[PDB]
Amino acid sequence: PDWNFEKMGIGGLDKEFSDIFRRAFASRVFPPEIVEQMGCKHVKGILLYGPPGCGKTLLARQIGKMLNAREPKVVNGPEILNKYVGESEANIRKLFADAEEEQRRLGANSGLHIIIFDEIDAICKQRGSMAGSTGVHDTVVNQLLSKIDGVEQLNNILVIGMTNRPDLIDEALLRPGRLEVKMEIGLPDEKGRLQILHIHTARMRGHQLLSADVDIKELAVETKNFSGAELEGLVRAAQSTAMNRHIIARGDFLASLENDIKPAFGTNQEDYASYIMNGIIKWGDPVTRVLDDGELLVQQTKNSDRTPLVSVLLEGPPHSGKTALAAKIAEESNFPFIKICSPDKMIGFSETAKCQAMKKIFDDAYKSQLSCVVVDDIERLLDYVPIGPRFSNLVLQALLVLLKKAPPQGRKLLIIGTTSRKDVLQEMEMLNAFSTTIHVPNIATGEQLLEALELLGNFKDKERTTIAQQVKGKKVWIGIKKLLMLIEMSLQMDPEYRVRKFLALLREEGA
Amino acid sequence: MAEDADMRNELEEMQRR
Ligand SMILES: Nc1ncnc2c1ncn2[C@@H]1O[C@H](COP(=O)(O)OP(=O)(O)OP(=O)(O)O)[C@@H](O)[C@H]1O
Ligand SMILES: Nc1ncnc2c1ncn2[C@@H]1O[C@H](COP(=O)(O)OP(=O)(O)O)[C@@H](O)[C@H]1O
């Protein structure tokens, strides 16, 4: 048995590789003297799917090495498509035909000619048959499958599909015998990542470049989610800094330094700033109780087995920093996965482009264990305007089924809307689908206002005595982003006129 | 796509004199 992962090449997926070894490839390592009786035809094809950067292409070449082909030819689907119909199918035929020569020539004792597709999922979209809308590329898949299971079948072959879209694949392509068996790869657990670090480190470990103050057992877990593809780049940076250390002129961790640089597949820390410019200024009880509620129901998911999915929206009047509050609710618990979906990046897109950007984010999130996702300015991506009712029906439909769609068993997430007006949503029946709501009252009172202004510290005791004189009495209704706006607008003034400029503008807010 | 281009091409004669 040659299938042990103490061999260095790959790791972390040991159960999944074990399964394919168990039922897929057992026939090919066995004494043939037995199996020649049973006439068991080997699996011609296999599929393995998962996220991109999780180390599948070193699985494939490594199984070829395990059971030796002449060699793999690896291809990407989009690397072959041609406008001219003949070329694409011809390319595929060339790929298979490399084997057929040996098969017919040397009969049935030939070694495997192995094929790998990097992504089929573009070429193998599921065709459907009617006079219109047959499809653009619907005739390449026919050539592929006619080679796989066709007339004058060949036993000289093995083919590994790789994809990130397992649901778009045709249903006959993966029927038993054409590709019989499917496996899932998922982004590795901490055990797998400490293995991975052992792998990519093993040369440095042998050469003893990095001798001190370095522990993989802790350094694996301090990053809760990364991609095995990304870890080799991380290790490269840790090796690169010792060489960038001698720009000044035996090895150190730089991981704690560079992890902030690294964008993950998972959580990012560099998108906060735009939503949080200034951080969270607690002006009164409502702020802290709101984010206390966020910290309250985050525990709900992580400790609940019967509510994998949960959702809220922060309603309130405009310019109350609901986006920032959602961002802070995300940041407080150090989630594995946080991500924004927003019109800032979905700008200038069609109603079916922003849906397919949003579904990408969510199906990305489904495959992490625990997650928090946030949607800001619902009205914007919903493309609402009051004059006329106008919106994209597609988007809200596709948004709320996602709010009602549970992820696979054992994975959980919460969803956070920032919608600023909910009357539309109550009439348009998204509010029964949201679990519950949060009112974010903007500041209602001057006794809290001057407190907030003290926390910011723009104005002196005299300038603030002015305010304390002018309004105790009014209940001012003001969004704080507007507060920032007009304090900065009055900050440029003749200093003598500064304060009453601010006051006069503030008294134009309405209500 | 929905693309059909069917095309032709021309010969460059070899010198055998
Ligand atoms: N506790 C808080 N109360 C009020 N504002 C805050 C609080 N914490 C942060 N902010 C501020 O909120 C601002 C973010 O702007 P904001 O999200 O209100 O615009 P917006 O609400 O998205 O616009 P719109 O009202 O059109 O949705 C930042 O300046 C940030 O510092
Ligand atoms: N044990 C491992 N587990 C996961 N990934 C690994 C492991 N060892 C190495 N890798 C990395 O996995 C990456 C796989 O990248 P590649 O297969 O080219 O893209 P994709 O995985 O999207 O097909 C390689 O770049 C390699 O550095």
A280 marked among binding-site residues: yes
Rounded Cα distance, A165 and A230, in Å: 21
Query: If you measure from the C-alpha of residue A93 to the centroid of ligand 2, how many angstroms do you get, rounded to a whole number?
Result: 28
Please tell me the number of the ligand nearest to residue A235's CA: 2
Neighbours of A385 (CB within 10 A): 9
Do residues A331 and A272 make contact, with C-beta atoms less than 8 angstroms apart? yes
Distance from CA of B8 to the nearest CA of A (A): 13
Strand blocks (E) in A307-435: 309-315, 337-341, 370-375, 412-417
Rounded Cα distance, A225 and A108, in Å: 46
**A66 three-class SS:** helix
Show the CA angle centred on residue A491, arms to residues A486 and A492, nearest 5°. Answer: 105
Given CA atoms A495, A496, A499, A503 in this order, what sign does their dihedral have?
Answer: negative
Show the CA angle centred on residue A479, arms to residues A390 and A395, nearest 5°. Answer: 25
Neighbours of A202 (CB within 10 A): 11
Do residues A416 and A375 make contact, with C-beta atoms less than 8 angstroms apart? yes
Q: Pick A137's closest partner by Cβ from B1, B4, B5.
A: B1
Q: DSSP 3-state helix, strand, coil percentages of chain B (rounded to 5)? A: 0, 0, 100
Rounded Cα distance, A111 and A250, in Å: 48
Q: Within 6 Å (CB) of ligand 1, which residues are found?
A: A 277-278, 280-282, 287, 318-324, 377, 420, 480-481, 484
Show the CA angle centred on residue A259, arms to residues A256 and A263, nearest 5°. Answer: 175
Q: Pick B5's closest partner by Cβ from A84, A136, A137.
A: A84
Which is it for strands A309-315 and A412-417: parallel, antiparallel or unpaired? parallel
Q: How many helices (H) and strands (E) does chain A have?
A: 21, 10
Name the β-bridge partners of A182: A47
Do residues A294 and A329 make contact, with C-beta atoms less than 8 angstroms apart? yes
Two structure tokens written together for A29: 């390592």
End-to-end CA distance of chain B: 47
Contacts of A137 in chain B (CB under 8 A): 1
DSSP-derived secondary structure for A441-454: PPB--HHHHHHHHH
Measured between alpha carbons, how far is residue A182 from residues A11, A49, A229 in Å? 19, 8, 22
Ligand 2 and A54: CB distance under 6 A: yes
CA neighbours closer than 13 Å in the CB half-sphere of residue A182: 14
Strand blocks (E) in A185-336: 309-315
The catalytic residue positions of A are: 322-323, 376-377, 404, 481
Contacts of B4 in chain A (CB under 8 A): 85
- Nearest of A434, A401, A412 to residue A365 by alpha carbon: A412
- Nearest of A110, A25, A8, A95 to residue A63 by alpha carbon: A25
From A481, A484, A509, mutation site for ligand 1 pocket: most ligand atoms within 8 A of C-beta: A481
Ligand 2 and A233: CB distance under 6 A: no
**B13 three-class SS:** coil
Pairwise CB contact (< 8 Å): A83 & B4: no
A279 marked among binding-site residues: yes
Do residues A66 and A28 make contact, with C-beta atoms less than 8 angstroms apart? no
Strand blocks (E) in A399-469: 412-417, 436-439
Q: Give every strand in the sheet of A436-439, ordered side by side.
A: A337-341, A370-375, A412-417, A309-315, A436-439
Q: What burial letters (b/e) apply to A456-466, b meaning 16+ CB within 10 Å? A: eeebeeeeeeb
Pairwise CB contact (< 8 Å): B1 & A83: yes
Rounded Cα distance, A232 and A216, in Å: 14
* Long-range CB contacts for residues A471-477, cutoff 8 Å, separation at least 24: A471/A446, A471/A503, A472/A446, A472/A447, A473/A446, A474/A446, A475/A444, A475/A445, A476/A443, A476/A444, A476/A445, A476/A446, A476/A449, A476/A506, A476/A509, A477/A317, A477/A442, A477/A444, A477/A509, A477/A510, A477/A511
Measured between alpha carbons, how far is residue A497 from residues A425, A486, A505, A506 in Å? 44, 14, 12, 14
Rounded Cα distance, A159 and A117, in Å: 8
Neighbours of A246 (CB within 10 A): 7
Q: DSSP 3-state helix, strand, coil percentages of chain A (rounded to 5)? A: 45, 10, 45
Do residues A252 and A242 make contact, with C-beta atoms less than 8 angstroms apart? yes
Name the β-bridge partners of A412: A370
Do residues A408 and A437 make contact, with C-beta atoms less than 8 angstroms apart? no
Do residues A448 and A463 make contact, with C-beta atoms less than 8 angstroms apart? no
Two structure tokens written together for A83: 């406008």
Q: How was this structure determined?
A: cryo-EM
Amino acid occupying residue A262: K
